[PDB]
Design a protein around this ligand. Sequence first.
Ligand SMILES: Nc1ncnc2c1ncn2[C@@H]1O[C@H](COS(=O)(=O)NC(=O)[C@@H](N)CC(=O)O)[C@@H](O)[C@H]1O
Ligand SMILES: Nc1ncnc2c1ncn2[C@@H]1O[C@H](COS(=O)(=O)NC(=O)[C@@H](N)CC(=O)O)[C@@H](O)[C@H]1O
Lengths: 335, 335
Amino acid sequence: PLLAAPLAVGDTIGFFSSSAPATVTAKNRFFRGVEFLQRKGFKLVSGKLTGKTDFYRSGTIKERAQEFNELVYNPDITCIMSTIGGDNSNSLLPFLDYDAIIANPKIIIGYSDTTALLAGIYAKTGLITFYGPALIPSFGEHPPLVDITYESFIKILTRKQAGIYTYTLPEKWSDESINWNENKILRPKKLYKNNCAFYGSGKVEGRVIGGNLNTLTGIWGSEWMPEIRNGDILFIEDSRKSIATVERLFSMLKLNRVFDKVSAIILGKHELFDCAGSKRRPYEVLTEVLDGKQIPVLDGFDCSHTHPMLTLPLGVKLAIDFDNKNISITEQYLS
Amino acid sequence: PLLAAPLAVGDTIGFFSSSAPATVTAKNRFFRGVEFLQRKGFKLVSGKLTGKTDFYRSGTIKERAQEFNELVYNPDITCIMSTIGGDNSNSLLPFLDYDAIIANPKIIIGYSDTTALLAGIYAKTGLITFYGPALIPSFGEHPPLVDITYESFIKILTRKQAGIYTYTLPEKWSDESINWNENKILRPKKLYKNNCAFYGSGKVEGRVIGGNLNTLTGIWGSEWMPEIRNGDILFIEDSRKSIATVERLFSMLKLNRVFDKVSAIILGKHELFDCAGSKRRPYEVLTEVLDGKQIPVLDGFDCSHTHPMLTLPLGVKLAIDFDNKNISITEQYLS
Ligand SMILES: Nc1ncnc2c1ncn2[C@@H]1O[C@H](COS(=O)(=O)NC(=O)[C@@H](N)CC(=O)O)[C@@H](O)[C@H]1O
Ligand SMILES: Nc1ncnc2c1ncn2[C@@H]1O[C@H](COS(=O)(=O)NC(=O)[C@@H](N)CC(=O)O)[C@@H](O)[C@H]1O
């Protein structure tokens, strides 16, 4: 695979808005995120669409593509980070400079709608990109949860590429929809004990592929959707969806013969899942869809829209030990 | 293609609930729809899930497939009609009795989420299915608009298969979210003049393919998604979507090279489109996505979630005359 150079404290991070114009609509949280990373010692370069609005998006399809490409062209930038997701990253794909990405591999990081770019770039270049923090939702989060997000971010991206890396489970998490863009807090978010579960036995090792499942529908069937292969570990997460939508997306995968190929599935914690009164969780819906297929599932991995968020390289081998209840990166993912 | 026997006054229509349990949740409208078709002289067979709920759906995946299959097995049934859409009909596709459908061709009709079944059945069997009325939303509609819906339904399905059929444009239409599930209207719906637009010149003739675009994402890439071919006319409609979602779905098509293949696009009227204050219509978004690709577009065809609704056979040749502002079926679609 194509590998980017590791991050170092003091490096320059460039940020871009490939969909929702949250540098404007969530300006307070945006500034918190900027200040957070600056205090850590990072230099920040604002993408050219920072502070701009085109109603539901940051700008035209071509302007958003240009914003991203310009960060690729900047020789000082080691990490290109999404500001926030939305709905519209997939529009950029015909216009991204994939040859420039190959010529100067950088850490590309984000989540949610940005999956379209992460998966698309991987499909075209083989670059190992990262499912992880976006500037506004992830680093604009108040302490204490932002600190755990940052610890994963910095650990994954700066560590020496010697031996496997085994994730540490966050002790507590939240998906509560408070303290978004308000300047100060009335109270901290409700914290829940980590209910991450390992359904299965033995050890499974395979290339991890996926991201935000709903977002993947926007690139599905195209040359920008990376082929899922025999032995892959499927990583999928969604946010604020109805159980109806979750069934639809799981069945889409079934129809595409995805469950005949995967060695394991990782379900990210689903932010504010709406079970429509059924009290059913996404795993139960998956079980029905699977129709008896014995695929081991890591249910509730902290790499999703919930806080805190771990950083995950996409397109490299992971090992999930279902007996010992841990997950590791086993393949080099930075140069 | 495989053709069903034509409909006739006095025939038996069977209905099924492949997703939302609206025979319960919209029971008043359901009863009005039943009464409407009965007064027209049709005999009705209730699918086995009528009157049942499993929270967000009518039953399990297998229960819903069974309900549909049992209608196919009934020799008395000429038309199999959706009660309503939802989100979840794509789940049924591995479990439908395609051999029985081939052996016993019937008129399969519905819209919205039911697109998954209409397109899926066509892909597997070559049967010409119909984008058209669902029992509850379409025939439970209060007068005056329900009569125009019915006129199209009965005309398309009972007419002699001799010569081309040219559609009549409804004089007025509405998309207002009122008068849903009560005995009486709150007040009359706003009746809009028909603003259907023909962008382009000359005549385009080709096989029509598509349906509800958001629903198509649930079968996309699979063996149940009919292959789009050079010269096809793409028919797409969506309902109650944000402009953000519409851009995403249009770009999905772009990435899949659909706009390199199709000779024309039909956009169904979009029910309660949310432009996010931009004042932009879906056609404007399509134009940006097309990036200079000249494809003639019929913008605002009355075959969608808006009232009244026309009946359209899928998988047969249509001719759109952009000069004379009309649309015709040019290929036999029933026995
Ligand atoms: N006003 C608000 N109040 C509270 N939280 C908010 C908020 N606005 C945003 N957030 C939070 O910001 C986070 C990131 O949003 S996102 O735009 O990146 N999401 C996506 O792209 C995919 N969901 C699209 C898909 O499902 O395909 C989410 O967890 C929200 O809860
Ligand atoms: N409570 C209510 N009040 C007013 N109108 C209502 C209503 N409930 C339903 N309707 C109307 O009933 C019609 C049919 O709904 S539907 O479930 O079949 N829709 C679909 O499957 C796709 N949209 C899914 C997709 O976009 O993928 C819609 O036009 C609604 O406005």
